[PDB]
């Protein structure tokens, strides 16, 4: 069953914020195995998606997806910043995202 998962696991940490002001437009994403801004440089520009399931089958499918792109690194620990077509809901903190391997440059 381990012949799939062409993506990389990630977790939605929070929004771009100060102590008291948030910016929901851009999200902070922590990619598994990425521990520095040098490693995050590889994942800049990749397509990160949030997959979720809902009751009503739009297109006859139970799964909806919010697409997005990795924009720039964040901090020294390898977290990146992402812009999604629809801003991510605030309840998806700690939810898992999927970072595809494309647009590839390797």
């Amino acid at each position: 069953a381990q012949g799939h998962r062409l993506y990389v696991k990630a977790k939605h940490l929070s929004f771009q914020r100060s102590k008291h002001v948030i910016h929901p437009g851009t999200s902070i994403v922590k990619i598994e195995g990425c521990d520095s801004k040098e490693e995050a440089q590889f994942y800049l520009g990749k397509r990160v998606c949030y997959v979720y399931k809902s009751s009503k089958a739009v297109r006859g499918s139970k799964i909806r997806v919010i697409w997005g792109t990795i924009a720039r690194p964040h901090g020294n620990s390898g977290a990146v910043r992402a812009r999604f077509v629809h801003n991510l809901p605030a309840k998806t903190f700690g939810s898992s995202l999927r970072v595809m391997l494309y647009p590839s440059n390797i």
Partner: protein
């Protein structure tokens, strides 16, 4: 942007013509109309219908021309038949393809 160029040994493709593969060669049919889709439409196309014998012959010809190289290099036929996949503990920014 949707390929990963692996460091696997190259395959000899000089012996097959590639000038016949053009945008017009792969182009779809014109529609110019919003009306589309049908159960019969899905029954149409498919591998069985359409897929002209000319396309069949080119695929057979290029396939047969690329067998001798992949048979010469050991472990390439099974490598091509396999499917790439990421497993636990694999970091794409570290591994080199």
């Amino acid at each position: 942007r949707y390929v990963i160029a692996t460091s696997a040994p190259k395959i000899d493709v000089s012996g097959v013509s590639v000038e016949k593969f053009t945008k017009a060669y792969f182009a779809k049919q014109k529609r110019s109309g919003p009306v589309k889709k049908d159960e019969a439409f899905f029954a149409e196309n498919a591998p069985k219908n359409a897929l002209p014998a000319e396309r069949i012959a080119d695929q057979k010809a290029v396939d047969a021309k690329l067998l001798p190289a992949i048979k010469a290099i050991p472990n390439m036929k099974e490598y091509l038949a396999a499917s790439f996949a990421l497993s636990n503990g694999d970091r794409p920014h570290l591994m080199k393809f």
